[PDB]
């Protein structure tokens, strides 16, 4: 599966630059990105982010540029919802770019 399907049929999307399927190549990379970006939210916890925000808020307080609406880390449930959304978006978009570039070229 990995060699004769993914590696062999990815040639169309990886070689689309300079053509009309170039967008599928860009989306193929962008989708691999969104998917990896989801792992930050899926593997982390709000406790760490809240503290990091505290030190950033300090810099905004020091320069008198701190917002009245207090910055807060995403809720635990929101953290999980953001992670799954970016995981599905990235993963499905990656297959989408791979499928459309491959089929349009060898259709």
Partner 1 sequence: EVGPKRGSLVKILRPESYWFNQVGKVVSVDQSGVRYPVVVRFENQNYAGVTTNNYALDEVVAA
Partner 2 sequence: DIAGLTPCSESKAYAKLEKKELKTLEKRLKQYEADSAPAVALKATMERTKARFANYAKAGLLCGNDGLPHLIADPGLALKYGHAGEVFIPTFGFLYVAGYIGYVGRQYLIAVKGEAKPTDKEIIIDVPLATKLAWQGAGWPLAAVQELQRGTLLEKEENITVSPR
Partner 3 sequence: ATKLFPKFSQGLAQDPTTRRIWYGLAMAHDFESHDGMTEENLYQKIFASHFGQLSIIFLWTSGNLFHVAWQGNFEQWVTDPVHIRPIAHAIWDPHFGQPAVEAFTRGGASGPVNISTSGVYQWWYTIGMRTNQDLYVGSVFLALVSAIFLFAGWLHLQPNFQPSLSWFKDAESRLNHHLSGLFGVSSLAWTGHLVHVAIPESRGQHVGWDNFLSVLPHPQGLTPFFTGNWAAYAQSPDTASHVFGTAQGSGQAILTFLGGFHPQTQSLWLTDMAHHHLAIAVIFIVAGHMYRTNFGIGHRMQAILEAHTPPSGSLGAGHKGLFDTVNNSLHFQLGLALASVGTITSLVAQHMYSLPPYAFQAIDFTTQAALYTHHQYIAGFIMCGAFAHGAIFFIRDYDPEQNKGNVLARMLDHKEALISHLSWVSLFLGFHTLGLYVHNDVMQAFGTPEKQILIEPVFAQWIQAAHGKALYGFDFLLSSKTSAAFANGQSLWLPGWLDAINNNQNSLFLTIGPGDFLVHHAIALGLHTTTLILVKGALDARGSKLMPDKKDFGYSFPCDGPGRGGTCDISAYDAFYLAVFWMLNTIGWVTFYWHWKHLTLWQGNVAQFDESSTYLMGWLRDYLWLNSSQLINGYNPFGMNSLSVWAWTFLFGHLIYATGFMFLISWRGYWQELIETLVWAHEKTPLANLVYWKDKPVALSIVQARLVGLAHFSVGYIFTYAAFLIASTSGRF
Ligand X SMILES: CC1=C(/C=C/C(C)=C/C=C/C(C)=C/C=C\C=C(C)\C=C\C=C(C)\C=C\C2=C(C)C[C@@H](O)CC2(C)C)C(C)(C)CCC1
Ligand Y SMILES: CC1=C(C/C=C(\C)CCC[C@H](C)CCC[C@H](C)CCCC(C)C)C(=O)c2ccccc2C1=O
Q: Which amino acids are annotated as binding site for chlorophyll a', given as ranges?
A: 32
Q: From CA 34, how far away is CA 32, in angstroms rounded?
A: 6
Q: From CA 35, how far away is CA 42, in angstroms rounded?
A: 11
Residues of this chain that interact with ligand CLA (CB under 6 A) are: 33, 36-37, 39-40, 43-44, 52, 56, 59, 63, 65
**Nearest residue to ligand Y on Cβ basis:** 79
Q: Does 64 bind partner 2 (CB under 8 A)?
A: yes
Angle 81-82-86 from CA coordinates, rounded to 5°: 115
67 vs 107, beta carbon nearer ligand Y? 67
């Amino acid at each position: 599966w990995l060699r004769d399907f993914l590696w062999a049929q990815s040639s169309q999307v990886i070689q689309s630059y300079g053509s009309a399927l170039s967008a599928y190549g860009l989306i193929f990379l962008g989708a691999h990105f969104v998917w990896a970006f989801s792992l930050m939210f899926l593997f982390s916890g709000r406790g760490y982010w809240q503290e990091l925000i505290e030190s950033i808020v300090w810099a905004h307080n020091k320069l008198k540029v701190a917002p009245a609406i207090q910055p807060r880390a995403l809720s635990i449930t929101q953290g999980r919802a953001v992670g799954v959304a970016h995981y599905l978006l990235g993963g499905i978009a990656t297959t989408w770019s791979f499928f459309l570039a491959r089929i349009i070229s060898v259709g």
